[PDB]
Amino acid sequence: MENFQKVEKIGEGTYGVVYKARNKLTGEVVALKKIRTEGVPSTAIREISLLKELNHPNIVKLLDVIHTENKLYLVFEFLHQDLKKFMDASALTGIPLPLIKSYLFQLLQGLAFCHSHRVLHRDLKPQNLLINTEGAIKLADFGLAHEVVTLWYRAPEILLGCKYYSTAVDIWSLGCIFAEMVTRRALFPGDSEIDQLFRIFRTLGTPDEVVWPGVTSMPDYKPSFPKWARQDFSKVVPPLDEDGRSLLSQMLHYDPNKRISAKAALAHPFFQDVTKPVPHLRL
Template sequence: MDKYEKLEKVGEGTYGKVYKAMEKASGKLVALKKTRLEMDEEGIPPTALREISLLQMLSHSLYVVRLLCVEHVLQSTDSISPSPAVSPSPKSNLYLVFEYLDTDLKKFIDSHRKGQNPRPLDPSLIQRFMFQLCKGVAHCHSHGVLHRDLKPQNLLLDKDKGILKIADLGLGRAFTVPLKSYTHEIVTLWYRAPEVLLGSTHYSTGVDIWSVGCIFAEMVRRQALFPGDSEFQQLLHIFRLLGTPTEHQWPGVTSLRDWHVYPKWEPQNLARSVPSLSPEGVDLLSQMLKYDPAERISAKSALDHPYFDSLDKSQF
């Protein structure tokens, strides 16, 4: 790790610390993600290696944060090693070296909501960010990878170029997602699909599409669409707006593990929650927030939705 000069800690991700650093040789800024790995007898666990090679492949998309390289740092154990029978497993850190981007969509939305100059996000900017987000998600899904934790904090922005990139991708399986991050902030539920909240163990690409819909609405509203602070409250937020789901609408919903009998709410008019959004935008949003995951629009189909008709797609 002598190649890098750590400049500051920029966060504690779900899997470990994240540093802003400079590559000494080139002067280029990078983000270093330090992940603790439990080594097994053969070294790095194969699950982790698979995840990393997947990340490297996915990051060839412009809309996924680029993984530049991986550095494996083995911490030296005592020089006088005990008998092999009781040798401690070596401590090992894996540093994932990513391109560095200085802001994320959450900070960007916050800057439009608070501060000296609160103002809505430009509708054409929302459209551009949405197109890039759907492109990035479609790219992941086409390689069989679910993100499972899409939220504005995980969408990094290159403000000068107007590019949005998906971050924190794909480590979910090898490093098992903890429910709390290291800083003990509760992992947010605001973007979590109802099938996950209801304890479904079989879920698919629809979980990411639901999150994309929530992010879409949040860019328009400048505040979260479903800001629940527990799984139960999260479901109630969703049911109050979209109506309590029925077996007719979503076959199998009442057999999900955490289903209870909920108050029966009627669906509200979605357009009222996003008053400044065009009718085409409201239509796309409603197709992302369908209860039955099988009915949600795919990321690839979303790219052809009329909401994007006025966009010059050749630039992407």
């Protein structure tokens, strides 16, 4: 862009590469995402056209949208770090619970907002969650629909072939991220769809018509799936207190309909003593 200069390469996203650009006119630092082009669908550009209005304190703000020379550029506000990085940086001691509680609360607020507007993220993960020195965390890289995208945060209904999945898939993803912050280890680190699915089955037990009505009708559901029993949560996410564990199990419900909503989660007693701490960030 004439008014932008790639100051750095933040990294390749899901929809294209992300560089740290400096706006030559306003002298501001932004996150420039180069979107992948053989014409660029007019229906897609209209979808992104809405996004600029979807403004929430917990959503990385989309500053502008440049569609020049059939090339699509998305300029976002620039945050200083992602949650994945922050966690690796806290691996020795682990993020303090008050911070974990604050980030979860904020993300639930953001999700509650998107969801009330019929918008799903679809691919929530640590790397898509941006944070700042102020202590805020935001949703980024929404699913606006050659590495190795992880399936670790993928909901079971998606892995089983459900096309019209709901906003519940985001709650599942956030539930996996929540558990990860607390234990400092991914909940379900699958390396293949089938592996991902079975690691989930081995922890929450293989779902059936009892815990998940209609499950045996899923497209990729095989009657030949191994039959695992459910594991105790006290063993799965220690040392999360009962309140935390209670909320987590509700976010990890098999039946998308039984899965707790973002707004409902906000009212959970776990956030009764929620505060907004400031992180010890290293930039």
